[PDB]
Structure 1
Amino acid sequence: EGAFYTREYRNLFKEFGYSEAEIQERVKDTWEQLFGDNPETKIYYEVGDDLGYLLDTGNLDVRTEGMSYGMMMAVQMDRKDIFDRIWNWTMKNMYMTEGVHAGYFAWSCQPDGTKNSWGPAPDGEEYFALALFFASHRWGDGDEQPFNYSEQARKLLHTCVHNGEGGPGHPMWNRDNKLIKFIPEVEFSDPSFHLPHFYELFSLWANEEDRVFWKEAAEASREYLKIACHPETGLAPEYAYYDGTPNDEKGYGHFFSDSYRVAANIGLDAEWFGGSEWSAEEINKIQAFFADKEPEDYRRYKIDGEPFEEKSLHPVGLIATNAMGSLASVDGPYAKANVDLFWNTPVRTGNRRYYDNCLYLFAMLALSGNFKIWFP
């Protein structure tokens, strides 16, 4: 039974023999390396007295993925000051009032706030919504907008489901199949965006008129992951059609950066809402695939396991997500090995570090029992 029911979160590091003190230290140190003054590893930058952002170090921009991740990290760490700085910057610079995506958040901005695009990234929106619910529950809704967290969360999820009913916009979920879309204007998806564990919570906290929908989306996403992951290797493509097969029209049909999050998502869903045979078997497959592979040699792979020459651009993120996956297969043959590999992998330095380090902190939180559901 999941932590949603028991209200107790598995500390997998502790169960695998790491000491409580060393785990506490490592979690704090990971946070400080990302959010404190550690220039080589840092991803969060403060602006003035009321603003802040996470920088995609590779692309030298600010992404809704990173901002929404940062808000989730901040609420898990009980840091309202950081949460509010990030959410303030997001609302000021990213929220769109004009164009076909009005009501959504521009996916990429320059550090000065300028929008690079008026298109959104749905995985940002879903993280914003849950982070905002958790903020409301930990701290209470603020008296002034946009710090009225729960109202902001319900409003955003309203748009995600209903956009286009009274305008030229489009929803972020397909209403017939209940699957999240890659972007609002296409009819394909991205397995790593599927967060059934988030949708379960939306089914409790969203506008009542959408609560049944969110339950259906949770179930649809769970079923979709079964068809999207390769049956032998467990590997999921970055983009996939609704039929589950890879969309490689632009090179996103393989196991690469986006895909890494699938194992992590499966880990967190198992922890929050309970284990399943499918999830344990899926994590065992991914871990088996990587069991004889050295991180320095990690590649892009076809989902059937065939390697490309191209190296993984985010091998530390891959390590972190595979370790986080162990939450879904705690007795798996490679579960301990993956957790140990992650323990022995430092936070990333250099220009590609942002993505790796986001995945790293999520795994540190989840594996230590600190990635929690915050209830009203």
Structure 2
Amino acid sequence: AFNNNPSSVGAYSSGTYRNLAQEMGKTNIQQKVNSTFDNMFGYNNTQQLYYPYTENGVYKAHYIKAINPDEGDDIRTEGQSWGMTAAVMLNKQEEFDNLWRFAKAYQKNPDNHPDAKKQGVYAWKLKLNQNGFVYKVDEGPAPAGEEYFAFALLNASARWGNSGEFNYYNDAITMLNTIKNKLMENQIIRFSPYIDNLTDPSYHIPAFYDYFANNVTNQADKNYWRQVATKSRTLLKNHFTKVSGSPHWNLPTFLSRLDGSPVIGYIFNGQANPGQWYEFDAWRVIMNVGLDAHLMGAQAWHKSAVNKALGFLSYAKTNNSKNCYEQVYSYGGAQNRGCAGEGQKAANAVALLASTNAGQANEFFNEFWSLSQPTGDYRYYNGSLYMLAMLHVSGNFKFYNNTF
């Protein structure tokens, strides 16, 4: 049965990981997790997201392909870093290394880049040109990518050691220093190096920063990352307070100021959507809250955040002619961007690790568990989230500490 009383002590401290699928009475859990990985990383052109990159017939590395029918397929740091994370959680070392090799070679901007803000950060969007060679479309970073890269590399160091192709640990420390020096403002993760007083709630994963604190050597850096963790929980708490009730109606948003205030409308040239939309980025916020609750302990704010957000989505479904909650809301109003897909449902299943409502658990978990693994033209985002969620709800998303 669903544990509606999540412990205030996290799995990272206790070593005790919940298996949410088991709590919900599901069978063949680990087999389903395994087939999810195998299908995503297999050469089937169906669920597949993991593709080899070759130059003149010579194998180089692998990437996660952000399949895109409208705008052309591209390659993204977040997809890449999530792929590495999935691989390390299931002890899939070749897949990890092939993805990391690609990132280090083709996504990393040179440390001597003329623009100091780009030095050592990871170009968020690549494509293959008309001859099949990789190039950077936008050299700017999407910092959730670097966050996951650092997280995946620290875990790889811990599981596999550092005597093979990669010194994972040294690569992780370099990544952490890049985040600190290039991708933070006042110890809050940036949306961009080029815009101040701006964050993206979905980039906040407080437990990762605690994990970083425990895996650096020097005292100043340990304290730095602990402060980032505290400030991240405060940002998310403040954001959830601000979106409570009218006018945001309990869903977190795409963009936020550093005090947690949703960004209203447009604020910069190139901006994809209005700041106050619950949209594709924002889907992940309560998933991150669930992650944090599970790994570092469930506090009153985690519970309130997820209970109210899932509560709104359940309500929204009853007022929908197609009996679904939708992909995009603004100020509590549906923006007609379609019924929720697999990635959004996946995000909401992970949020249940902070839920105290068995009725929400039954509804949201079964809607995720009944899905087939994503296929077709929109499988990049849906499929990547689906993979992460499969790890989170099966007790397979763990923190592996390094030893010193």
**TM-score normalised by length of structure 2:** 0.85
CA–CA separation in structure 1 for the residues paired with 2:276 and 2:323: 22
Give the secondary structure class of the aligned counterpart of 1:109. strand
Q: 2:184 aligns with which of 170, 173, 177?
A: 173
**How does 1:1-376 map onto structure 2 within 5 Å?**
1-19=9-27, 22-47=28-53, 49-58=59-68, 59-97=72-110, 98-100=113-115, 101-111=118-128, 112-144=133-165, 147-162=166-181, 171-175=182-186, 178-187=187-196, 188-206=198-216, 208=218, 209-229=220-240, 230-232=243-245, 233-247=249-263, 248-249=265-266, 250=271, 251-292=274-315, 293=317, 296=324, 298-302=326-330, 304-311=331-338, 315-329=341-355, 331-376=357-402
> Counterpart of 1:158 in structure 2: which amino acid?
N
Partner of 1:168: none
Between the two structures, name the one with larger relative contact order (CA 8 Å, sep ≥ 6): 2
Whether the 8 Å CA contact 2:216–2:222 is kept in 1: the answer is yes
CA–CA separation in structure 1 for the residues paired with 2:93 and 2:356: 33
Shift of residue 47, structure 1, vs aligned partner: 3.4
CA–CA separation in structure 1 for the residues paired with 2:164 and 2:388: 30
Greater strand share, structure number: 2
> Counterpart of 1:25 in structure 2: which amino acid?
Q
Partner of 1:165: none
**TM-score normalised by length of structure 1:** 0.91
Whether the 8 Å CA contact 1:32–1:38 is kept in 2: the answer is no
Shift of residue 207, structure 1, vs aligned partner: 5.1
Shift of residue 320, structure 1, vs aligned partner: 0.6
Whether the 8 Å CA contact 1:157–1:206 is kept in 2: the answer is no
The answer for unaligned runs of 5 or more in structure 2 is: 1-8
Which stretch shifts more, 238-247 or 194-203?
Answer: 238-247
Shift of residue 296, structure 1, vs aligned partner: 4.9
Structure 1 segments, 4+ long, off by >3 Å, are: 47-50, 294-297, 330-333
Shift of residue 52, structure 1, vs aligned partner: 0.4
Whether the 8 Å CA contact 2:307–2:357 is kept in 1: the answer is no
Give the secondary structure class of the aligned counterpart of 1:78. coil
Give the secondary structure class of the aligned counterpart of 2:188. coil
> Counterpart of 1:237 in structure 2: which amino acid?
T
- Sort the Cα spacing of 1:105 and 1:207 in 2 relative to 1 into closer, same or farther, 3 A: farther
CA–CA separation in structure 1 for the residues paired with 2:37 and 2:366: 19
The answer for unaligned runs of 5 or more in structure 1 is: 163-170
Identity %: 34
CA–CA separation in structure 1 for the residues paired with 2:284 and 2:297: 19
Aligned length: 360
CA–CA separation in structure 1 for the residues paired with 2:305 and 2:62: 38
Shift of residue 185, structure 1, vs aligned partner: 1.9
Which stretch shifts more, 128-137 or 335-344?
Answer: 335-344
Shift of residue 341, structure 1, vs aligned partner: 0.8
Partner of 1:167: none
CA–CA separation in structure 2 for the residues paired with 1:7 and 1:82: 26
Whether the 8 Å CA contact 2:202–2:254 is kept in 1: the answer is yes
- Sort the Cα spacing of 1:296 and 1:37 in 2 relative to 1 into closer, same or farther, 3 A: farther
